[PDB]
């Protein structure tokens, strides 16, 4: 058991979902029609991949997932795409009108018309679970749906499923692939509303991913497809412990124990390596020490910030592929005596390590080179608050003039909600400052 239900909200959530589930299928040897020849228990099973896939009597392995968007055209591509057989039609939910880059429309005007339906379809998945562990929610901060509808859904899920764990994969906005000028507004509103309802949230800075695609894969102008294939690899690394077994396999919930010292401090910084092109990876083996050292290069982070100017409250290393503890310990010992790694005084300094022997996988015609070993570092750093600071500043510039606020007020929102949301962010920035101060 220990099933996990994924929820993909809005364009970003859906399109990232496409990349993730395609990648999952290739890692588990699942065909586009859902058949899995290596799986001998037909119609069911308690294997590790069953945490993410249910099984029909016809031998089809179906994602424990719901795709939701208030506009049909993005999910319509899933309905007619390569993996259309993978999903039951009821898992793919669409409206007729998007939220138009407006949190208010996603949370209230348009979202309220479909929220009951979404919950019913989620319930149908949950009732198929013998031991539901929690939910994984994929969405953007900037979109009207990814922002507005997600926060509504998260609130409703806390009511219907109590304290059942809810994890986030949140797309942090970037100017290079921006879709609206009010994305800072939507970002602050969602973070505020969702904060009490999320147990752990993995932010993905689009500018960080944009930079990595340009720098490491030599993609002159990355597309959403370029970004998503990289993101899915990070997502895969994090969910790998849930989808595979192994002696040195450490469950994500154990890392989570170390990563969240206080309920509001639940935003880990992800760093992934190696991101390298086929041209460069040829006749070039990146060792355990090399990819581990790459985790402390800020250029490889999922979020733009400087941990070297912050303090650590946890450090987790999630390896996959040809990796043994001996080489990990040696690599860590080297790194500790050469890097700017400083912990807060109220937390132990030991790195938590997990290893999944299942080697990394790449999607056909992709840009990422296929390597024998990869690593995803999850660290709790005060430096991630820099991401909040940049967003909150852009929020302040516009809100001081109440620019674009009328689009929200017109949908029933009040200025009090804006100020309430901003104050919560101010307290959150203060929280990250406080946890970094030395004990008395």
């Amino acid at each position: 058991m220990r099933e996990c239900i994924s929820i993909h909200v809005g364009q970003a959530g859906v399109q990232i979902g496409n990349a993730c589930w395609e990648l999952y299928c290739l890692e588990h040897g699942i065909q586009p029609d859902g058949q899995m020849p290596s799986d001998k228990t037909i119609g069911g099973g308690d294997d590790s991949f069953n945490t993410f896939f249910s099984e029909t009597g016809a031998g089809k392995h179906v994602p424990r997932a719901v795709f939701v968007d208030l506009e049909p055209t993005v999910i319509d591509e899933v309905r007619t795409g390569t993996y259309r057989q993978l999903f039951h039609p009821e898992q793919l939910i669409t409206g007729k009108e998007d939220a138009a880059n407006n949190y208010a429309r996603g949370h209230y005007t348009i979202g309220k018309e479909i929220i009951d339906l979404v919950l019913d379809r989620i319930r149908k998945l949950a009732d198929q679970c013998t031991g539901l562990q929690g939910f994984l929610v994929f969405h953007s901060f900037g979109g009207g749906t990814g922002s507005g509808f997600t926060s509504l859904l998260m609130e409703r899920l806390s009511v219907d499923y109590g304290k059942k764990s809810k994890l986030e994969f949140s797309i942090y906005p970037a100017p290079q692939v921006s879709t609206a000028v009010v994305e800072p507004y939507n970002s602050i509103l969602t973070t505020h509303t969702t904060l009490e309802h999320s147990d752990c949230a993995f932010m993905v800075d689009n500018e960080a991913i944009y930079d990595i695609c340009r720098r490491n894969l030599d993609i002159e102008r990355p597309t959403y497809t370029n970004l998503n294939r990289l993101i899915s690899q990070i997502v895969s690394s994090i969910t790998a412990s849930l989808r595979f077994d192994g002696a040195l396999n450490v469950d994500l919930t154990e890392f989570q124990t170390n990563l969240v010292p206080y309920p509001r401090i639940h935003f880990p910084l992800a760093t992934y390596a190696p991101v390298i092109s086929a041209e460069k990876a040829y006749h070039e083996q990146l060792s355990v020490a090399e990819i581990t050292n790459a985790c402390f290069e800020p250029a490889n982070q999922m979020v733009k910030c400087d941990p070297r100017h912050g303090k650590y409250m946890a450090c987790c290393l999630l390896y996959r592929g040809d990796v043994v503890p001996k080489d990990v310990n040696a690599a860590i010992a080297t790194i500790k005596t050469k890097r700017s790694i400083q912990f807060v005084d109220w937390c132990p300094t030991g790195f938590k390590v997990g290893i999944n022997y299942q080697p990394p996988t790449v999607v056909p015609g992709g840009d990422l080179a296929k390597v024998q070993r990869a690593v995803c570092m999850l660290s709790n750093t005060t430096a991630i608050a820099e991401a909040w600071a940049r967003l909150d500043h852009k929020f302040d510039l516009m809100y001081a003039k109440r620019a674009f606020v009328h689009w929200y007020v017109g949908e029933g929102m009040e200025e009090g909600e804006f100020s309430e949301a901003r104050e919560d962010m101010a307290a959150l920035e203060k929280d990250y400052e406080e946890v970094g101060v030395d004990s008395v």
Partner: protein, 427 residues
């Protein structure tokens, strides 16, 4: 006098399964549960740990407990997995997530009654139950939380029976989560009140032995458990085999524990060996005696020279001159009489068993009630305080209904225990 064995949690079941694997071989019992030995010495007191069935089948009087089926499924598919009574497998599905509160108050409370039914069924079969022995860790959630819950409820239903524990202490050198000092401190609070005898098995010591002495570059839990199973076989020898005194759990407690709360023992073992690597040269008695008393051979990371021995029990195994053992043991006491309290006359006892453990022609196991054990609890207390002063990671516990006051109380009692051990170090 029957003993009921219990093993709780991942650690508890893994060292527990290893314990049964080792002594079964010593008593000539195979995985099938059939005896195939050559000495009558093996079966004379085999009733202490084994039930007998028709056709002369020997079944361990053991109860396997956990809140997740993962580790117990590995046991049942392990070498001696089939020997255990299948009805004694009592497990949940939710797990404890390395959370003492979950094991003690919520998840474990839901399963604890099912366990006690199996304890009761085993006890009613006993001609004269002497007590219980528990294997568990203190750093996790199930073995620590639910384990101490079981102990409390077992005491309620069997208040005149002895409770013994093999408690694995957490260490940053071999750590799973950061909340281990919380779980450990909460557990020690329970063990002080509700056990008569606790063998302190320190993972810090086990790691150091494997790394420094055994020259194992990167020791695994399996490497750590080779030292545990060797120690456990040793300390239970006088319970399992015919000896000069025919020791039981109560007589051990009376002789080892001068004050009720000071019942936390430092185990020691010699020679220290690693898995697979066979030694060809048997140690002389003077070597066994010198090594077993050395800090490097202590299973608890405490310097015995930083304190004084209240009581000491020792067991030499193998064919040797018991006269030579007597001389050497008397020599240690006469050479270092300052590390033995003078207000407990003749506080060192030694026994000898003919049967040696597998792979060794002779060995020596050490059980010491030293005031130096305070170093262990002080270490846990410091790690506890470093987090608790900022209330770090406390939401995992308050989320299960616990209050901050319960942490403060647990902290105070362990610090009291420390000062109590310090009191007799300067007597």
């Amino acid at each position: 006098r029957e003993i009921v064995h219990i093993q709780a949690g991942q650690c508890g079941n893994q060292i527990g399964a290893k314990f049964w694997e080792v002594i079964s071989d010593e008593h000539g019992i195979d995985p099938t549960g059939s005896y195939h030995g050559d000495s009558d010495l093996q079966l004379e007191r085999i009733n202490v740990y084994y039930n007998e069935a028709t056709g002369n089948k020997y079944v361990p009087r053991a109860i396997l407990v956990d809140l997740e089926p993962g580790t117990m499924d590995s046991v049942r598919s392990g070498p001696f997995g089939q020997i255990f009574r299948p009805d004694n497998f009592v497990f949940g599905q939710s797990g404890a997530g390395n959370n003492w509160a979950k094991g003690h108050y919520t998840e474990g409370a839901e399963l604890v009654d099912s366990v006690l039914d199996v304890v009761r069924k085993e006890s009613e079969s006993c001609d004269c139950l002497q007590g219980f022995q528990l294997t568990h860790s203190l750093g996790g959630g199930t073995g620590s939380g639910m384990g101490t819950l079981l102990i409390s409820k077992i005491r309620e239903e069997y208040p005149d029976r002895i409770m013994n524990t093999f408690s694995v202490m957490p260490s940053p050198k071999v750590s799973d989560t950061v909340v281990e000092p919380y779980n450990a401190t909460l557990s020690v609070h329970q063990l002080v009140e509700n056990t008569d005898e606790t063998y302190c098995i320190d993972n810090e010591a086990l790691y150091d032995i494997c790394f420094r002495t055994l020259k194992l570059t990167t020791p695994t839990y399996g490497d750590l458990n080779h030292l545990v199973s060797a120690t456990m076989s040793g300390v239970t020898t006088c319970l399992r085999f015919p000896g000069q005194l025919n020791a039981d759990l109560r007589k051990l407690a009376v002789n080892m524990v001068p004050f009720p709360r000071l019942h936390f023992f430092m185990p020691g073992f010699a020679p220290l060996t690693s898995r697979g690597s066979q030694q060809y040269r048997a140690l002389t008695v003077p070597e066994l005696t010198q090594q077993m008393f050395d800090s490097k051979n202590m299973m608890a990371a405490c310097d015995p020279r930083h304190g004084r021995y209240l009581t000491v029990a020792a067991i030499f195994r193998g064919r040797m001159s018991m006269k030579e053992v007597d001389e050497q043991m008397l020599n240690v006491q006469n050479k270092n009489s300052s590390y033995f309290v003078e207000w407990i006359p003749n506080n060192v006892k030694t026994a000898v068993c003919d049967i040696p453990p597998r792979g060794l022609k002779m060995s020596a196991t050490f059980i010491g009630n030293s005031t130096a054990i305070q170093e262990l609890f002080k270490r846990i207390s410091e790690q506890f305080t470093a987090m608790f002063r900022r209330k770090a990671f406390l939401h995992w516990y308050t989320g299960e209904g616990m209050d901050e006051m319960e942490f403060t109380e647990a902290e105070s009692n362990m610090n009291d225990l420390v000062s109590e051990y310090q009191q007799y170090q300067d007597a």
